[PDB]
Enzyme design. Structure first.
Site, PDB file in Angstrom:
ATOM      1  N   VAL A 163      -0.841  -8.792  -3.846  1.00  0.00           N
ATOM      2  CA  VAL A 163      -1.391  -7.765  -4.731  1.00  0.00           C
ATOM      3  C   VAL A 163      -0.364  -7.119  -5.651  1.00  0.00           C
ATOM      4  O   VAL A 163       0.662  -6.625  -5.191  1.00  0.00           O
ATOM      5  CB  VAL A 163      -2.172  -6.689  -3.944  1.00  0.00           C
ATOM      6  CG1 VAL A 163      -2.899  -5.752  -4.896  1.00  0.00           C
ATOM      7  CG2 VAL A 163      -3.154  -7.320  -2.966  1.00  0.00           C
ATOM      8  N   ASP A 216     -16.438  -7.074   7.508  1.00  0.00           N
ATOM      9  CA  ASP A 216     -15.114  -6.526   7.798  1.00  0.00           C
ATOM     10  C   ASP A 216     -14.998  -5.066   7.378  1.00  0.00           C
ATOM     11  O   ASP A 216     -13.977  -4.668   6.832  1.00  0.00           O
ATOM     12  CB  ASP A 216     -14.033  -7.384   7.115  1.00  0.00           C
ATOM     13  CG  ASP A 216     -12.626  -7.152   7.646  1.00  0.00           C
ATOM     14  OD1 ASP A 216     -12.497  -6.645   8.796  1.00  0.00           O
ATOM     15  OD2 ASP A 216     -11.647  -7.466   6.908  1.00  0.00           O
ATOM     16  N   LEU A 223       2.136  -3.524  -5.537  1.00  0.00           N
ATOM     17  CA  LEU A 223       1.337  -2.700  -4.629  1.00  0.00           C
ATOM     18  C   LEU A 223       1.508  -3.082  -3.163  1.00  0.00           C
ATOM     19  O   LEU A 223       1.529  -2.214  -2.294  1.00  0.00           O
ATOM     20  CB  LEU A 223      -0.148  -2.777  -5.012  1.00  0.00           C
ATOM     21  CG  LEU A 223      -0.492  -2.294  -6.410  1.00  0.00           C
ATOM     22  CD1 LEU A 223      -1.886  -2.715  -6.803  1.00  0.00           C
ATOM     23  CD2 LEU A 223      -0.344  -0.797  -6.516  1.00  0.00           C
ATOM     24  N   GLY A 224       1.594  -4.375  -2.897  1.00  0.00           N
ATOM     25  CA  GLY A 224       1.738  -4.880  -1.541  1.00  0.00           C
ATOM     26  C   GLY A 224       1.449  -6.361  -1.463  1.00  0.00           C
ATOM     27  O   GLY A 224       0.691  -6.892  -2.277  1.00  0.00           O
TER      28      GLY A 224
HETATM   29  C1  LIG Z   1      -8.936  -4.915  -3.741  1.00  0.00           C
HETATM   30  C2  LIG Z   1      -8.263  -4.995  -5.101  1.00  0.00           C
HETATM   31  C3  LIG Z   1      -7.430  -6.259  -5.219  1.00  0.00           C
HETATM   32  C4  LIG Z   1      -7.451  -3.749  -5.400  1.00  0.00           C
HETATM   33  C5  LIG Z   1      -7.698  -2.779  -6.394  1.00  0.00           C
HETATM   34  N1  LIG Z   1      -6.813  -1.786  -6.400  1.00  0.00           N
HETATM   35  N2  LIG Z   1      -5.953  -2.109  -5.376  1.00  0.00           N
HETATM   36  C6  LIG Z   1      -4.862  -1.446  -4.882  1.00  0.00           C
HETATM   37  N3  LIG Z   1      -4.582  -0.221  -5.377  1.00  0.00           N
HETATM   38  C7  LIG Z   1      -3.460   0.588  -4.915  1.00  0.00           C
HETATM   39  C8  LIG Z   1      -3.628   1.116  -3.506  1.00  0.00           C
HETATM   40  C9  LIG Z   1      -4.874   1.114  -2.887  1.00  0.00           C
HETATM   41  C10 LIG Z   1      -5.017   1.526  -1.573  1.00  0.00           C
HETATM   42  C11 LIG Z   1      -3.922   1.956  -0.858  1.00  0.00           C
HETATM   43  C12 LIG Z   1      -2.669   1.976  -1.446  1.00  0.00           C
HETATM   44  C13 LIG Z   1      -2.527   1.564  -2.768  1.00  0.00           C
HETATM   45  N4  LIG Z   1      -1.242   1.683  -3.378  1.00  0.00           N
HETATM   46  C14 LIG Z   1      -0.185   0.837  -3.263  1.00  0.00           C
HETATM   47  C15 LIG Z   1       0.826   1.364  -4.015  1.00  0.00           C
HETATM   48  C16 LIG Z   1       0.301   2.535  -4.556  1.00  0.00           C
HETATM   49  N5  LIG Z   1      -0.956   2.746  -4.181  1.00  0.00           N
HETATM   50  N6  LIG Z   1      -4.152  -1.918  -3.876  1.00  0.00           N
HETATM   51  C17 LIG Z   1      -4.568  -3.091  -3.304  1.00  0.00           C
HETATM   52  O1  LIG Z   1      -3.873  -3.545  -2.250  1.00  0.00           O
HETATM   53  C18 LIG Z   1      -2.695  -2.815  -1.766  1.00  0.00           C
HETATM   54  C19 LIG Z   1      -1.708  -3.819  -1.207  1.00  0.00           C
HETATM   55  C20 LIG Z   1      -2.286  -4.541   0.013  1.00  0.00           C
HETATM   56  C21 LIG Z   1      -2.730  -3.556   1.075  1.00  0.00           C
HETATM   57  N7  LIG Z   1      -3.707  -2.588   0.503  1.00  0.00           N
HETATM   58  C22 LIG Z   1      -3.150  -1.838  -0.663  1.00  0.00           C
HETATM   59  N8  LIG Z   1      -5.623  -3.794  -3.720  1.00  0.00           N
HETATM   60  C23 LIG Z   1      -6.311  -3.284  -4.759  1.00  0.00           C
END
Ligand SMILES: CC(C)c1cnn2c(NCc3ccccc3-n3cccn3)nc(O[C@@H]3CCCNC3)nc12
Length: 272
Positions: free
Chosen positions: A16, A112, A8-9
């Site tokens: 993540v 935050d 995811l990132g």
């Molecule tokens: C906060 C928890 C740890 C969580 C739950 N779910 N989750 C997602 N879900 C996917 C997502 C959410 C928001 C925006 C984009 C995505 N995404 C990434 C690929 C496809 N969808 N990403 C991230 O964290 C990620 C990575 C770090 C930056 N924020 C998004 N953290 C999470």
């Protein structure tokens, strides 16, 4: 003990990944980064509110497991193809404020609040994230923080809520300051320079400085598509005096939330 599905990132703050549960096959996300940690982790596991991110399990190597979310409010705001109707905004605000009220009731400040910290699932449920122990944000920072206040309260989160509301209405950041000094200038040019009547004890703040006197732009001119009930909500969220600023419980009781139209149901909220 978990099945890694996707990436995811990543960052130095947390790593993540997308993954599947090995007990009930439920898709969850994992944040990989001790007696003192368990004290905070068990408290977070004890919290339960539909509009607050849930800590399901943990792992020694600091690994935390939360529910999986599709996007956040920042992705939605930046999507030109998406249309935010008044009912859509009211739904996001109702959920954000219901989650914040739970935290404030349990003596927890978010500290935050910003759009990328209000996450959304496949069923259109908003959940607040990133508030448990520290192991761009200037735009959402309250004026008491910008004047160097070391002791602060709920007003810090409430001011950020007003900034998120203004971003849903304008589709661009409300006060995009280029520096901590420019952030205070943008706040005062937009909302007016506060007087000793509007903000008593402002002069005793650690980094207090005398700014040029600005009249401010009337809220009705800034938010041209907002009704009187929404303008009252915005005015309460942006009061200079941190003690006078509206609380999450006070905000939920405003006529705005009980007036027509009602909030869009989760399943009908726009998805990217
Ligand atoms: C906060 C928890 C740890 C969580 C739950 N779910 N989750 C997602 N879900 C996917 C997502 C959410 C928001 C925006 C984009 C995505 N995404 C990434 C690929 C496809 N969808 N990403 C991230 O964290 C990620 C990575 C770090 C930056 N924020 C998004 N953290 C999470």
């Amino acid at each position: 003990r978990y099945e890694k599905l996707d990436f995811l990132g990543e960052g130095q703050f947390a790593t993540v990944y997308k993954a599947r549960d090995k007990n009930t096959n439920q898709i969850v996300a994992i944040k990989k980064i001790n007696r003192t940690a368990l004290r905070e982790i068990k408290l977070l596991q004890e919290l339960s509110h539909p509009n607050i991110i849930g800590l399901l399990d943990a792992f020694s190597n600091i690994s935390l497991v939360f529910d999986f979310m599709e996007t956040d409010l920042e992705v939605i705001i930046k999507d030109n193809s998406l249309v935010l109707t008044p009912s859509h905004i009211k739904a996001y605000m109702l959920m954000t404020l219901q989650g914040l009220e739970y935290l404030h009731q349990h003596w927890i400040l978010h500290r935050d609040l910003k759009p990328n910290n209000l996450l959304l699932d496949e069923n259109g449920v908003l959940k607040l994230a990133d508030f448990g122990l520290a192991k761009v944000t200037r735009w959402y920072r309250a004026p008491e923080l910008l004047f160097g206040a070391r002791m602060y309260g709920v007003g810090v989160d409430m001011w950020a809520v007003g900034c998120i509301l203004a971003e849903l209405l304008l589709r661009v950041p409300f006060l995009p300051g280029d520096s901590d000094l420019d952030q205070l200038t943008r706040i005062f040019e937009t909302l007016g320079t506060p007087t000793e009547e509007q903000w008593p004890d402002m002069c005793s703040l650690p980094d207090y400085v005398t700014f040029k006197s600005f009249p401010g732009i009337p809220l009705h001119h800034i938010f041209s598509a907002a009704g009187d009930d929404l303008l009252d909500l915005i005015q309460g969220l942006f009061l200079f005096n941190p003690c006078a600023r509206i609380t999450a419980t006070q905000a939920l009781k405003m006529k705005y939330f009980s007036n027509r139209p009602g909030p869009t149901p989760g399943c009908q909220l726009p998805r990217p």
